[PDB]
Scaffold this active site. Sequence first.
Site, PDB file in Angstrom:
ATOM      1  N   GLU G  10       0.823  -1.202   0.000  1.00 17.46           N
ATOM      2  CA  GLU G  10       0.000   0.000   0.000  1.00 17.46           C
ATOM      3  C   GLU G  10       0.861   1.258   0.000  1.00 17.46           C
ATOM      4  OE1 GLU G  10      -0.678   2.177   2.782  1.00 17.46           O
ATOM      5  OE2 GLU G  10      -2.212   3.269   1.660  1.00 17.46           O
ATOM      6  N   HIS G  11       2.075   1.162   0.541  1.00 17.96           N
ATOM      7  CA  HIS G  11       3.032   2.258   0.442  1.00 17.96           C
ATOM      8  C   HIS G  11       3.679   2.319  -0.934  1.00 17.96           C
ATOM      9  CE1 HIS G  11       2.482   2.808   4.653  1.00 17.96           C
ATOM     10  NE2 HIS G  11       3.337   3.815   4.650  1.00 17.96           N
ATOM     11  N   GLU G  87       5.946   6.413  10.559  1.00 16.23           N
ATOM     12  CA  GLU G  87       4.540   6.636  10.877  1.00 16.23           C
ATOM     13  C   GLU G  87       3.968   5.646  11.880  1.00 16.23           C
ATOM     14  OE1 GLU G  87       2.148   6.556   7.501  1.00 16.23           O
ATOM     15  OE2 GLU G  87       2.337   4.408   7.164  1.00 16.23           O
TER      16      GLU G  87
END
Lengths: 420, 420, 102, 198, 50, 49, 149, 57, 78
Positions: G10-11, G87
């Site tokens: 997803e990154h 994150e």
Amino acid sequence: QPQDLEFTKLPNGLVIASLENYAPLSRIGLFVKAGSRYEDSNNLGTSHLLRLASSLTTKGASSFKITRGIEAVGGKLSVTATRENMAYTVEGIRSDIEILMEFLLNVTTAPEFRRWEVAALRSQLKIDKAVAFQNSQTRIIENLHDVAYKNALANPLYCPDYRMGKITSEELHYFVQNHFTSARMALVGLGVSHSVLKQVAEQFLNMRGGLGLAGAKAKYRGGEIREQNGDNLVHAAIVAESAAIGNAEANAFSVLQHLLGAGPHIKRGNNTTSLLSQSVAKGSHQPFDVSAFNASYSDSGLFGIYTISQAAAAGEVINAAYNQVKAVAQGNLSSADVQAAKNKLKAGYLMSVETSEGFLSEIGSQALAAGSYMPPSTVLQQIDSVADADVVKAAKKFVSGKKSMAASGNLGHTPFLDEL
Amino acid sequence: QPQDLEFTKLPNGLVIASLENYAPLSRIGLFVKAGSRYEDSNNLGTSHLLRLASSLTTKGASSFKITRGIEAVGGKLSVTATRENMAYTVEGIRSDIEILMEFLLNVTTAPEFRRWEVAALRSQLKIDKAVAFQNSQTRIIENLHDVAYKNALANPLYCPDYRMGKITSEELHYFVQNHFTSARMALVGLGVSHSVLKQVAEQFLNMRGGLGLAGAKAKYRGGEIREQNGDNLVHAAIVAESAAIGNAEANAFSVLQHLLGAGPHIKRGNNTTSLLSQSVAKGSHQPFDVSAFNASYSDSGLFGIYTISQAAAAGEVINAAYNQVKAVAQGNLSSADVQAAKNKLKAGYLMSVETSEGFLSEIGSQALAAGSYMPPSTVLQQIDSVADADVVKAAKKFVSGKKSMAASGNLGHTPFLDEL
Amino acid sequence: SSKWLDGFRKWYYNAAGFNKLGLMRDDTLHETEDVKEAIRRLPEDLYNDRMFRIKRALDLTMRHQILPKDQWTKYEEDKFYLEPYLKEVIRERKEREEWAKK
Amino acid sequence: PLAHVAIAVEGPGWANPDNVTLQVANAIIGHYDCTYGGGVHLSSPLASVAVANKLCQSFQTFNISYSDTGLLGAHFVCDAMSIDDMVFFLQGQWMRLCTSATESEVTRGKNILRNALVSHLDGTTPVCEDIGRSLLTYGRRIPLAEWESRIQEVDAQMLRDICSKYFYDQCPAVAGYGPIEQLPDYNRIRSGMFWLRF
Amino acid sequence: PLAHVAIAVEGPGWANPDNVTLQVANAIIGHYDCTYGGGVHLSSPLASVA
Amino acid sequence: SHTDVKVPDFSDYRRAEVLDSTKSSKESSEARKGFSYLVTATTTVGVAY
Amino acid sequence: KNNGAGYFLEHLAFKGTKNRPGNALEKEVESIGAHLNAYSTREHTAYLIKALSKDLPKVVELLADIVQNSSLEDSQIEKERDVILREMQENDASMQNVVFDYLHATAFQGTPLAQAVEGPSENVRRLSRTDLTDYLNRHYKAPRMVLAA
Amino acid sequence: MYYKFSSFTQKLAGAWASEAYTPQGLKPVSTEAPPIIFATPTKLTSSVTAYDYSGKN
Amino acid sequence: MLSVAARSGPFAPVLSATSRGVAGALRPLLQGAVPAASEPPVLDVKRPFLCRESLSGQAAARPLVATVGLNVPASVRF
């Protein structure tokens, strides 16, 4: 019979000046160039905490021992600080003051700075800042010096609200090891001899380098700060750059200060020989107070106008004072007014050096600034050499400079810098 | 499919806009030109308490009746205040909405403003201000507005800390009776027939036919504020005077902010087509966030750059962004970049009115400003009618104007306004 | 003192039995004003380690269990973390008491 | 400075209709934070109690669904001294929905759920999210008229039957973070999930 | 915000020399302010308990 | 991180019908609380006698 | 053992494909003014784009390679490993998300629904391109995809 | 700028641009991952709940 | 193109403030909560200045000098 003050410059840079008053009481001070001038943005409020934490434990005397032994002989321990330098003072009887110096030198030379005690008096920092900011002149001058300079003189006397709880003992240790060095100190004694002071300087004081850290030269900034806080009176200081301590124009700026009015010479008077008060008195009909502000430092100075006025009358008070200074700067003044200003200035100096606190403060200031003590008669003589043309030059220096403004109160009708 | 939007200008100056689209739930909003623009130094923060006074007792409904009756039908009442105007929006399922309308009617026409309820509400406005200033962008934008303007737009969205506990009911009553007049309001209904809005407006919008109090005329001062809070990040907004809304230069400044980069388009993106991000990413090897700020009002505008950077590498980021704006102010740009900027601007505008809230806010502001509908295609062709020289002269008008700077954080390496 | 006193100290350390609850020596000290002040003067890391070791010991003595023998606190690895703080508090209390005598 | 506590039980998942009923139950208890401008007159009993006693900073109910499983419960942030009281209050609210739910309360929850379901799908992004998630979970796009038909089936008797099925005498899952020693043990939280008077 | 309370008794005046003795009594109790430096270690027991 | 926090295995103390993680609960929970409440009910009956 | 594979794809899904290498792909979507977003849950992954209707073809083409032609490069793997660690450090401050993860762990002990979407830190430190290729070959097939508009 | 998936109802809610499209913060370097120690050596097994047996096989 | 908040793309919720008098069905994301902060210390009532005679000398003329002590009150002199 107050024979002569003796002066001594040791090879490590330490100054010892003492006078043999043969007084009943002795006053001994240590003057260190360790003010708020010598902090960058990393260690803001360290000098305030060190000023409050002078009475903590030391490597050689505990805080219980320091407090109980100072109060046991009835002596006084005080710390007096400005932006430039700090001063430590003990007051006592001649028979006890010797061991009193022992306590003082511990406070200067070997502080342990235990972590729990620093964590204890950070609340004392908060309380002391609240008490000192109960006066509005404090926050006006603090914001004025913050706006008037970029670095090294915009740092406040009082710790900012974010740094409280963020100062550790390592920063105080760094401040002591970098600014309490040997060639930044003057040891002043009143009611003592030279031999005992030389002995205690040889004992406690002769271990550090001496040069320390310099600072950041105090670049001028300019601008304005307006703090709307809702009081009955509006305070406004408008300053501009002026000559420093030791310059030939500091005397002319002080003469211009006392010519424009720097304090009431009569209780409940009308300030007849004050030019700013004369102009605002013929202008307004409400309570007010206008004076001239002078603040000269090691490499910079600020000269300006301080006004306390009503909320709806601040513009006419500020404009009346500023137009009075503009009329002074064009050469509209009399020689008798300059003579009375010189009389006021030298009278204020002579009545400032009369008590032992003011005398020792002036000796320590002279030793830290020039490194050579001068008699008061020499100070009056160089006051007498000021001509009125240099006063007009000082007024034109104020008029033709970039002003810095600090204001507080109801700012509905308070003007701005471009509107002046 | 719906029919076109329908307008009505009542003789007391009330604008009525309605769209009949047979929505499952309807949106009713009253738009009043009664923001924080219209206060002065004596009644600061009245718009903040008036924003939170939307659930107090009126005549016709109590606080209990308003809260329980709106929550019983599941509807929602909110109010959104910008620095120029306020918007009271109710929403709910269609078969109930008329009763919701009279609730909004009371809140907008006859507030009781009892003293005990506003004395209860002032603590809530303190808590709301704390929640709002929990983030740093809000604090630095309110500081930037207080520095950029000297009147009528330096008044913040949130009440100042000294004014809390001091706003009375008389100031609220004065503000309502001088700014909530019928010649400054627009009643907009999505999902309601035009006859229902016209009937309610003829019923109870016939009390204040004047134009109210107006003509504040915000002026520009410039300067800088530097909040040292010691954070790891440094925020800095540098703006200048730009054109108001009602001009083709406003379109030019919007094309200019989307050319320089006006926020993210890609989750965890690099902002490659942003010129400012391209310049700073060529410079800095640390995380940053550079964007273009453009707040356009009806009388003045602010345009500049907003930078977030590290504490030590702030000067490089700020100088690279300013030199990028300087380079695009000298004609050095490509027309494909301007075409992509126009596409970004029109896509953002079409996505803004995509939801019902953005559409109602847009038509409320259009009815308040011009009183007539601007269709989206006319907005798109007005975007398309902007040349490259207009964007060049907009950036030239930015770079030649005196800046307002607001900085927050560890500002040891942050420059001053003389060093841009 | 050389041969068996250290050996008797090791045997007594095994026999007293606070090592099999993971406790150090200075965790076992009963609080007084002096011990509470010395605990208050501790840094955050040693304070948190002490309080975790104490509640681990209370968990173990709840279930009438002990730690595995490899997790017993070793006699040589046992650090006397508190006793400089305790000795400083005792010294300043003695100074206050002798000042109150005179 | 503040403590977050989340309490949950089982919910049935995506493809069981009484989720709609459970949604109505959440609409009865609802959400609150300190910036809501209602005062002491909010319709939710837990919100009015927490405003009057100054307990919460915020609370929020949730229903979370995965393939034949889910988490149904509440989550609140408050200071330490309030925590225990709120747990009691929160559990009391659940037991009220298990025992003595009324009809106006169910009607208010139904109107709140109607407004939530319609006003959530405003704009193409949440509509597209509903389409993709509905084709992945339900196997089809459930239309909003079908949602309105299922909401209209809810009355008070079946709501308190469903709430007794999913809340009453059930072991919760409790997570906490912060100054949480006034948050009780698992035995008192578990004992608070039933009434001795039924 | 906070209260000021003064308690006094009758004292002798100027001519009575035991006034000096009374001064020493005041010097045992002394004074205390919130902005002092000594803390708990002041010699005055009233100031230390305060 | 907070995502490194993993609950340890409780399978030694765990009851018999809740052992495997691949079987859903709410199928034997009623039997578990029926056993525990039967223990409590028999205790209450005895002390009532 | 591949507990953060979906999050790490997803990154990297927006960092470049085979026919659009790197930021040029990013430039393309900014060249049409469209907004590109994604999320990853415990059960579903979504890549969505807000755009104008008049550019419906090109966006679909972009979506195509984003789900089937992602170029997974080693340098991008290293820097996005550092970004994911950053994150997770950021999401440790979001305290309600911490209690959300804790509640899932303690409620779904021993099951694959206890593990977080971003997974533990060691899996971020150690995951290799072959593991991501196995995850994308196993779970990115066409019967499980819904194209929604 | 527009939508972020959150809000405990598993919904694409509305959120600000600084958190919807920049979820990773501006902090430069990740600092550490502090390890977890237990009282007893626990068999914290994620998959299949460690082992299931009753003797020697 | 009106709606001055939506003129600025990312600076829409910073230029505007959106209170909610009656909170609706959908909860806002990031509810938010104040920490239990501290309190300022209490101080006595100060000296107001209601006449020209009391205001004389209050205008500052010299730089700010602070002084603390072990048993003397803290002072600031201008």
